[PDB]
Amino acid sequence: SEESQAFQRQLTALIGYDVTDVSNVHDDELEFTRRGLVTPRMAEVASRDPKLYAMHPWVTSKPLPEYLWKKIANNCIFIVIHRSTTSQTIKVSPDDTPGAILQSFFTKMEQDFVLRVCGRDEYLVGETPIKNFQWVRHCLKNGEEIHVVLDTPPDPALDEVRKECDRKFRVKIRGIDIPVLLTVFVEANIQHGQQVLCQRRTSPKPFTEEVLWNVWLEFSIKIKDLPKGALLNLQIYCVQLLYYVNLLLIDHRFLLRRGEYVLHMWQISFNADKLTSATNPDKENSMSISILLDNIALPRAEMPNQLRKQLEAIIATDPLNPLTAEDKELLWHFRYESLKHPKAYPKLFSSVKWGQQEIVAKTYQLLARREVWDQSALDVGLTMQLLDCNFSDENVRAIAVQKLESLEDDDVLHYLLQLVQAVKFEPYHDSALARFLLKRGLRNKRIGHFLFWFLRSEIAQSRHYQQRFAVILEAYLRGCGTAMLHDFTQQVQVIEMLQKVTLDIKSLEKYDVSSQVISQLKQKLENLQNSQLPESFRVPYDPGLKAGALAIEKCKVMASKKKPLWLEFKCADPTALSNETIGIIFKHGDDLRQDMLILQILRIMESIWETESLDLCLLPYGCISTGDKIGMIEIVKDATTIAKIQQSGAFKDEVLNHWLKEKSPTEEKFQAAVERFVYSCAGYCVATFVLGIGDRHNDNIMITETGNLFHIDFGERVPFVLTPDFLFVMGTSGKKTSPHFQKFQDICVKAYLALRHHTNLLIILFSMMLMTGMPTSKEDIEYIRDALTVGKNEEDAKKYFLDQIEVCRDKGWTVQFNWFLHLV
Numbered sequence: 001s002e003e004s005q006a007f008q009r010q011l012t013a014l015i016g017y018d019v020t021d022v023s024n025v026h027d028d029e030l031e032f033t034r035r036g037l038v039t040p041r042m043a044e045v046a047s048r049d050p051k052l053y054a055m056h057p058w059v060t061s062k063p064l065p066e067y068l069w070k071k072i073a074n075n076c077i078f079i080v081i082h083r084s085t086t087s088q089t090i091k092v093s094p095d096d097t098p099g100a101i102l103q104s105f106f107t108k109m110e111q112d113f114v115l116r117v118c119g120r121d122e123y124l125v126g127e128t129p130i131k132n133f134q135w136v137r138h139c140l141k142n143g144e145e146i147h148v149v150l151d152t153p154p155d156p157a158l159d160e161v162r163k164e165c166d167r168k169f170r171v172k173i174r175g176i177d178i179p180v181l182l183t184v185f186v187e188a189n190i191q192h193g194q195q196v197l198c199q200r201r202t203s204p205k206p207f208t209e210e211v212l213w214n215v216w217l218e219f220s221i222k223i224k225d226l227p228k229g230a231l232l233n234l235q236i237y238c239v240q241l242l243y244y245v246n247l248l249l250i251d252h253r254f255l256l257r258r259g260e261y262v263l264h265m266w267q268i269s270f271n272a273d274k275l276t277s278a279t280n281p282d283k284e285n286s287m288s289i290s291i292l293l294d295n296i297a298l299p300r301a302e303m304p305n306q307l308r309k310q311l312e313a314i315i316a317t318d319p320l321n322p323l324t325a326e327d328k329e330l331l332w333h334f335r336y337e338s339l340k341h342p343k344a345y346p347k348l349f350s351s352v353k354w355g356q357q358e359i360v361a362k363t364y365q366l367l368a369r370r371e372v373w374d375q376s377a378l379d380v381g382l383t384m385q386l387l388d389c390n391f392s393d394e395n396v397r398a399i400a401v402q403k404l405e406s407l408e409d410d411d412v413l414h415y416l417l418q419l420v421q422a423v424k425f426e427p428y429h430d431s432a433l434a435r436f437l438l439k440r441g442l443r444n445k446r447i448g449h450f451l452f453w454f455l456r457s458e459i460a461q462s463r464h465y466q467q468r469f470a471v472i473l474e475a476y477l478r479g480c481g482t483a484m485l486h487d488f489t490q491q492v493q494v495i496e497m498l499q500k501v502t503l504d505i506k507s508l509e510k511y512d513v514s515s516q517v518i519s520q521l522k523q524k525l526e527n528l529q530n531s532q533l534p535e536s537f538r539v540p541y542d543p544g545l546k547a548g549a550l551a552i553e554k555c556k557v558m559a560s561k562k563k564p565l566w567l568e569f570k571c572a573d574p575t576a577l578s579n580e581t582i583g584i585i586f587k588h589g590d591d592l593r594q595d596m597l598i599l600q601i602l603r604i605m606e607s608i609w610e611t612e613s614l615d616l617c618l619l620p621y622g623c624i625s626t627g628d629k630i631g632m633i634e635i636v637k638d639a640t641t642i643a644k645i646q647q648s649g650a651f652k653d654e655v656l657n658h659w660l661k662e663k664s665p666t667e668e669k670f671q672a673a674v675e676r677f678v679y680s681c682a683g684y685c686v687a688t689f690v691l692g693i694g695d696r697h698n699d700n701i702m703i704t705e706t707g708n709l710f711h712i713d714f715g716e717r718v719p720f721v722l723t724p725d726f727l728f729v730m731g732t733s734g735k736k737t738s739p740h741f742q743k744f745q746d747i748c749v750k751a752y753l754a755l756r757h758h759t760n761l762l763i764i765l766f767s768m769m770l771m772t773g774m775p776t777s778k779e780d781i782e783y784i785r786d787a788l789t790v791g792k793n794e795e796d797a798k799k800y801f802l803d804q805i806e807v808c809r810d811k812g813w814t815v816q817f818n819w820f821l822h823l824v
């Protein structure tokens with residue numbers, strides 16, 4: 001009664017939205033959704049192992065790749081256990097568990113200890129080999145030593161949770177109202193997975209602040225034939241589309257929707273925002289439409305060769321390959337043959353007349369005989385397809401979520417962002433996907449941390465979906481535990497402190513930054529640290545890192561038009577061996593949602609390349625959107641742009657080679673940096689060509705002192721950046737060939753073909769990226785299909801990509817120059 005007052009108040013602040021608010025609704029779905037999610041929360045809180053929940057050991061069951069096996073000498077791993085002062089190095093075999101490693105220590109010198117990593121709140125514990133922890137693999141990858149602190153297991157009490165009809169369907173369009181303002185009409189559609197079943201327009205009246213029709217619109221479709229999730233899509237045109245809004249004809253309690261509705265509309269090729277049951281909360285300025293609904297609840301033969309081959313041909317096509325009327329009818333007639341092929345499912349369930357009850361019944365009868373689907377090896381791409389906008393049946397979407405259950409927590413992180421955005425395609429608030437995210441979020445602190453920030457990011461900058469995500473986020477926070485509630489509170493404060501500074505500082509816009517503006521920043525960062533700021537906080541992009549006090553000397557405003565903040569924190573962990581500060585960039589103004597999605601696809605391409613033992617050394621530096629147009633980015637130490645290397649605005653060839661030569665002390669190291677360059681450049685060439693973001697200016701491409709190339713901004717045409725200065729490191733020039741350039745070619749083709757083996761996964765994540773993260777036509781989605789050379793053999797595709805390399809060779813500097821040329 002009394003204790004709930006402050007706690008709900010608290011939850012609102014972490015969310016950035018009041019989930020008890022009733023100002024922008026016309027039914028109790030969101031409240032029923034809150035009350036519904038209590039069950040899966042309390043089960044997962046009850047079921048989770050309290051010891052391992054606190055430890056959150058970051059583990060994988062995948063094979064350790066062939067490249068990291070070469071780094072291992074003779075079945076031996078050096079691990080350095082530390083006391084408060086002294087430390088000893090242990091020889092360990094990759095197969096050894098935390099337990100077996102702890103037996104070796106006690107013998108050398110009660111088991112109430114755990115091998116915590118130095119500098120980070122990350123642990124080595126549980127029935128897992130030392131090779132199967134992700135932190136150990138990071139050390140082997142980067143060539144770092146493995147440093148550990150023998151200390152106390154953290155008390156699980158810190159993670160404690162608080163207590164608690166054959167008639168036709170019709171709609172009356174009364175009229176439209178707008179406070180402030182050609183002809184105008186209203187188009188009422190009946191939608192199921194953005195497939196228009198039924199459509200009726202009104203008569204075109206003149207456009208004014210009030211336009212009334214009072215017309216019954218009788219549709220073709222009957223009441224009984226309406227499927228669950230069917231979406232009454234009201235739209236206002238004037239030739240051109242101005243406003244839109246949606247209403248679910250069958251509600252969360254399976255009841256037919258009836259009564260008067262004054263729905264406030266959104267304002268302006270398809271987008272994830274167009275599907276939302278959310279009405280516009282800005283009632284002061286928005287367009288409005290009035291409707292009345294007065295209408296009850298929702299309740300063995302040999303196939304020919306040629307048709308079998310015709311059917312198998314249809315299953316073999318990519319997701320974006322459209323099914324004709326003929327293709328669908330074939331898939332349906334032979335649905336029991338189709339059902340034996342898991343890859344058919346998206347096409348099969350796309351080939352269903354969802355506006356007929358008898359057919360949907362048969363579709364549900366078909367989903368019962370699911371032996372092959374349940375037994376099938378998990379395909380994530382195929383699963384993602386069944387959660388996109390094209391599918392809106394609950395039971396269909398459920399079988400996709402069923403396959404996701406088997407994923408490791410390591411795999412959930414790889415797809416978490418895209419799975420969070422997939423919630424936008426759910427017809428109803430409460431869903432199998434939402435519950436899966438919550439359930440896997442509560443089971444694992446790391447997933448839960450990144451879940452919090454993914455939901456909070458959307459809540460801050462999506463009026464279309466903030467209501468939905470908030471209810472989910474409130475449900476996570478109600479079971480995450482006191483420890484994590486405190487951590488999120490400390491993080492949310494720090495971001496709120498820094499959001500104010502960056503907003504005020506920018507006002508004080510010519511590209512050159514003033515000297516006193518830096519001193520003004522340092523004045524405010526003195527002020528912040530003294531009074532309001534918390535002593536430490538978890539780094540949102542890397543929650544293992546505990547960033548403490550703030551190094552005011554090294555902080556500055558960065559020489560850009562958008563004036564981001566170069567920030568630099570001292571580490572909070574005393575066991576931290578390195579004295580190097582935690583560099584963080586904090587930017588404002590840009591919309592990071594789009595780029596954050598592209599980075600997650602880049603992280604996915606790494607894991608594809610890992611499974612085929614290729615280490616292309618991409619950099620997906622920590623990059624989290626922390627709120628409305630603001631986010632924290634990891635500062636890669638020892639890194640600079642190409643443009644600063646060049647301009648030190650002319651163009652030169654030999655400079656990039658000299659920059660590595662000088663910055664590398666020993667000549668033997670320089671070649672390892674050249675090796676790192678050739679891999680990274682190959683990786684960044686392939687990936688940018690696939691995503692269609694290769695044509696880029698030098699300033700947005702960076703390079704480490706250790707030779708690692710990477711990109712920091714995403715958008716005669718060039719397919720990708722392979723300019724002369726890159727090639728001068730590689731050896732070739734003009735019309736010649738070199739050994740490193742042939743190695744570059746070998747990695748690019750092996751990289752390109754590797755990605756082509758997961759063509760469907762890449763296509764669907766690309767398709768989803770454009771729908772969920774943008775203010776998009778089929779032409780836009782159709783690029784990646786052409787870029788991946790769909791339906792073509794490997795030798796044909798090798799030829800394709802090697803020509804794109806030669807296109808960059810033929811043009812050379814021609815495209816780089818045009819940045820400056822078009823500027824005036």
Ligand SMILES: Cc1cc(-c2ccn3nc(N)c(C(=O)N[C@H]4C[C@H](O)C4)c3n2)cc2c1C(=O)N([C@@H](C)C1CC1)C2
Pocket residue numbers: 558559560564585587590591592593595596621623631633634635636637638639640641712713714
């Ligand atoms: C603005 C920005 C800087 C970095 C970045 C990352 C790591 N590092 N390490 C360094 N040493 C630097 C660095 O010196 N950056 C200076 C910028 C130039 O003046 C040189 C760096 N930058 C990443 C992104 C951005 C940006 O907008 N993104 C977008 C694409 C994303 C949504 C937020 C990424």
